[PDB]
Amino acid sequence: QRYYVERPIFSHPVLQERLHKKDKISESIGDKLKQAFTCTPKKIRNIIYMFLPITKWLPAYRFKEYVLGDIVSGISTGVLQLPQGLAFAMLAAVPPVFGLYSSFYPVIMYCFFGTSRHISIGPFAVISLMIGGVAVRLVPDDIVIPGGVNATNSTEARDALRVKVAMSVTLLTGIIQFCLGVCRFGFVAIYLTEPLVRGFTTAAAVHVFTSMLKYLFGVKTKRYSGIFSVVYSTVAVLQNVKNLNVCSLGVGLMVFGLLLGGKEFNERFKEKLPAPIPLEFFAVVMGTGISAGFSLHESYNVDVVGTLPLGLLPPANPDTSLFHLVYVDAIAIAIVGFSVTISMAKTLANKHGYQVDGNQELIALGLCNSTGSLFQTFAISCSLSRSLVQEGTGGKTQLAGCLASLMILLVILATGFLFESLPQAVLSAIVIVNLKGMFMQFSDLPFFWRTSKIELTIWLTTFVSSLFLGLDYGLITAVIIALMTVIYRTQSPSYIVLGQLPDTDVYIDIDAYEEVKEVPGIKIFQINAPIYYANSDLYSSALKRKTGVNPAFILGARRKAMKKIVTKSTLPEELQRFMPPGDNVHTIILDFTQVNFMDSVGVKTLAGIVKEYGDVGIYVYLAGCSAQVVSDLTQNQFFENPALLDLLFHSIHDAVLGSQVREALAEQ
Amino acid sequence: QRYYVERPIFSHPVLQERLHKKDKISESIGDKLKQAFTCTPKKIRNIIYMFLPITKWLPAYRFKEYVLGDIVSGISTGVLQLPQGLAFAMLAAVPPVFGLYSSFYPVIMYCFFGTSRHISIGPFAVISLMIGGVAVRLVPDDIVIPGGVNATNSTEARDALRVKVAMSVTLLTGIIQFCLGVCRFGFVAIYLTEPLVRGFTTAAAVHVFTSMLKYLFGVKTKRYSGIFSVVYSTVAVLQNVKNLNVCSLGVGLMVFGLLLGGKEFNERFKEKLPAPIPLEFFAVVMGTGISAGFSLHESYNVDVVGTLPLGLLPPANPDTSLFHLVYVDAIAIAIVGFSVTISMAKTLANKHGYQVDGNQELIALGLCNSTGSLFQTFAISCSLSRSLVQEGTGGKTQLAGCLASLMILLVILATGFLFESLPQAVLSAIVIVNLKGMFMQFSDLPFFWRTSKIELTIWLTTFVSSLFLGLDYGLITAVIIALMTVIYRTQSPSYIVLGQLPDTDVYIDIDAYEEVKEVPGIKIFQINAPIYYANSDLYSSALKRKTGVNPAFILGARRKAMKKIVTKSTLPEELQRFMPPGDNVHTIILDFTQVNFMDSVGVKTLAGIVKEYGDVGIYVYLAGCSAQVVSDLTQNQFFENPALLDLLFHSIHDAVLGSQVREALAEQ
Ligand SMILES: [Cl-]
Ligand SMILES: [Cl-]
């Protein structure tokens, strides 16, 4: 009922003498490998449930509740896949049909191999932009085809060569992703914080907006990429806005307005409506119907999707020769794609709670990309707005994605010619209106401003670095800056001078309470950070500052007054009332409860502190050293003198009692 | 004499109620600026003693003891400056005389502006190699001079253009260093640990060895630089070893042998010899005498220094136009130079102990470089072997460097033509033999292997990165890797399950002592690392593993048995002896004494842990939360329910007593 202890003062020697070490258990790397190579049925089942996750949940799928939600979610996400897929195919400098292949082959496989049950794997704009840049670089727009035969200008051969470049790029991306996954690369997903994921995603949103502005405005500018891409693209659009198409801009604007109104209607009418209406289906149908009936393309020169072929291309081995240079690109796409997909998988897991294993995620994506590259496709990561829509509608399982893949297959097989008249402005408006859920992530700035300025710094710096400095070189910069923020937290700790609560052993801050009173002749210093090379000199200077006791000025003042082995040396100064007034502190207790670790530089600084405080005549005691800290002290030869083991104490109260009893004994 | 406390169980509400907050002191940035703009005589003196350090020590120079040591040290360091200066001028693709200017103008100024009193500022090989590469790139060896007039081949105009390129490079380097120094860039010197500094210095030693191998062997290969420079240079030397000069190799080898024998003699005879003999003076004199008497250059084609001009060139403004491209180089030289000089300044300070302020170091070097760039010089950092020699001989003050500068001035003014016959092999041997003190730093591998494997990792990785990947891109990699080692220490902590020492409040590890016995029904978990985004899921998994209590399997087992707001929910399972045997733990105490900080991800994981443990029916208590940790918990909305403030406890014993009294009360 009451805190009552009556024990002797537990310094380091006393506690070590009262204890006996317990025998260690066997540790053998050979034994670690031993059980691994022994086959057991349970681990065999676990290997399968780890590599083929569909074997786990699909036989246990619940038909009572999940069926309706998955059907609705699949319908909505496929209705979103179609225009997003076509537009993202347009973004990749490839014929629009290959977007449909990109949205069918890798979707079905992720159902077999993937982990997250709320994630939609379709083409993504930034990866599509990278592939389009790769295609442009290898085969430029102004390329002379040796075939001839046909009249002036040709598009089929150039597009075929571009899609072959994409086939090599995505095959290399899939191979790299599979190799990373099998080499246990899923641990790196732990370094993508929520602040670093949300900033990255919002930067990607801005990039997509500025990329599709070109098609929204009907302008025919360049495809500036790399560093400073967003600003270059937006200024190129702004300069060439004089060549805008009034018809295309008008149809795009009315499509965007209808989409925004429908989204607002769905949000307001969430409760009474059993399921959100497929608004994008109405938008696409109305756009293609208006374009076909009014013949906008032949009338006023409106950009159109084109002719979407009707049929499944037979599996085809991709070129591996292009791997010569596409390698530097493939690696970037595989990094960016993995980062984005694991970011949203972690977001969905935090929202709901399930297995989000990144290793099997990378394995599944690597298998999908390669097993798709052989099927006339391109790089496929997780889509962002579509994933948000799928999770919002009520998506429960991955069968929703399979339904979307089935509907896209139906579009490829039967209704591929209905969208041959669909204007590109409709696709641009559909893509832009779906970024709204991603631009809503800008609300984190006030919340993080109120919560923690370091998290706000991470958010702002990843947003800026992934906006103005590309999206592939922005992720690495953001991760490094997050790690340096951790280092900064370790390099600017809270230096607290402690004080003793009366009649108790509670030691808390002296500047933040009135009961807390300092123990006469004793000053306690606390640092809530490890003492290592980065914050060692800072720790020593703060110790000299806060406690008000620095050996340098004390020794100098002894010298000025004179003008007119044992750890410490007693003061030999002749009795004189010329010392500047002070509290004649005899011991300085250092709090090591919060010090996690110490390296060689920290140990050297600690030895220097002890030596220079003992030269003046002031003891230094270490309170609450952890086992690891004592190991670092012993290994770095801090305890060469066995008498330095008496400085350590188990707690602050033990150190204070030791100092008091030492002073009492010294008087006698 | 004995640890005796009798206080009530201090949970968070009780302690907070017993305390009252103390009024904060005024904090105003305006007040910070206020006193800065007010002029006081003491701060005026301090500004001067900070910018002109010579005003501090020079009037207080002690003539009794320092004079002889400084004279000897200055003689030795100047005798080392001469051949090192000439060889490093040879390394920079500039006439050898400019090495003499590089060793006079910036040395005298550092005496006025520098801080460290044991540091020698002369030309350095790697900086000289960078400048020589800059000169080669801007003006190649095969350049057509429009002057004509003279016969085939010309060297004066090409060398003048090269030295003008060096004049722009070093002026930009000095300007950049001064700007960094005045912008308070000396804080970055805290991130250069000893393991990193020593690895960097040994890599520089290997680079210098492989660079001067070319002159030692008499081979006339290329000047490969950049990435993979050491291997390229050494293979180029090895392939062309068939064109070696027997005479030059022989004289270089005998010079090296004489130098090594003299060094061994000096080391063995340290006590009886009043002062080390100037061995390099004998070596240079003998080499030039033999070359002049035997006429090696005209006889057997031995490489020679050349003609060293006799006179001081009048101050001359350097070109600023070359700053167009030399900028990318100048910045690299200023970084590498500052890193090296602050590394050895810190090493000397740790050896002795004095002011090593890096800001004034950068200011002094920036002033020296620019004020020399205007005097026909090049980039000048701290020399390594020469600094070691100066500190070893007994150098006390910077007047030793001034003596070396004076002797170099005498060489320039009077005896500049004595060394016109000195072979380059002698210079190469002299430079190589002085690296011995730097190759002795390889002994850190066993010491760091015994002491700490992470420090050994830092040492090895900085050595490899600064050896095989250049010296300018190696420093940044080493610093980043050191910071990631800190992050790794935070991501692999020691998960310790604690136990109670009998009849006392000491809680220590349960697997490392026999007295330590676990409190029945209570399991204590300790992590000596902050709970943040990097090690949050790892912490939760370790909590489930070590303590043997995971809510997932417990709930699953309740479900299997069934087959046959308040923070926690009591167990409703009907009384059945089908639970797998356990210790029916009722509370799990988490130790937060060693947790420095928590971010949003850590708080979310902690809330999830508390919720999922309360669903089963097991309390979770937090023991020893710091003020900063409680602030992070409160800001991140962990304490939205006021009942969660009762979970916090001041110490482990308080939490154990609270759990015991709660269990006792529950029975009644
Ligand atoms: Cl998107
Ligand atoms: Cl050197």
Numbering used by the authors:
A (entry chain A), B (entry chain B): 14 to 577, 619 to 722
Give sentences copied directly from the paper behind this entry:
Hearing sensitivity in mammals is sharply tuned by a cochlear amplifier associated with electromotile length changes in outer hair cells. These changes are driven by prestin (SLC26A5), a member of the SLC26 anion transporter family, which converts voltage-dependent conformational transitions into cross-sectional area changes, affecting its footprint in the lipid bilayer. Prestin belongs to the SLC26 family of anion transporters yet is the only member capable of displaying electromotility. Prestin’s voltage-dependent conformational changes are driven by the putative displacement of residue R399 and a set of sparse charged residues within the transmembrane domain, following the binding of a Cl− anion at a conserved binding site formed by the amino termini of the TM3 and TM10 helices. Recent structures determined by cryo-electron microscopy (cryo-EM) have sampled prestin’s conformational space under various anionic environments and located the anion-binding site at the electrostatic gap between the amino termini of TM3 and TM10 helices.
In a HEPES-based buffer, prestin’s NLC shifts to depolarized potentials, associated to a more expanded state at 0 mV that is coupled to low anion affinity. Based on the above studies and the large size of HEPES anions, we assumed minimal binding of HEPES anions to prestin and hence associated HEPES condition to a putative apo state in this study. We associate the HEPES solvent condition to an apo state as the HEPES anion is too big to fit into the chloride site and prestin has a right-shifted NLC, To investigate further whether HEPES anion binds, we determined the structure of prestin in the HEPES-based buffer using cryo-EM. Our initial attempt to solve the structure in the complete absence of Cl− was unsuccessful due to sample aggregation under cryogenic conditions. Aggregated particles were greatly reduced in the presence of 1 mM Cl−, and we were able to solve the structure of GDN-solubilized prestin in 1 mM Cl−, containing 190 mM HEPES, at a nominal resolution of 3.4 Å. Surprisingly, under these conditions prestin adopted a ‘compact’ conformation, virtually identical to the previously reported Cl−-bound ‘Up’ state, displaying a clear density at the anion-binding site. This density is incompatible with the placing of a HEPES molecule, and we reason it to be a small population of Cl−-bound prestin resulting from a weak Cl− affinity (e.g., EC50 = 6 mM11 implies 17% bound). At physiologically relevant low Cl− concentration (1.5–4 mM), prestin’s binding site is likely to be only partially folded.
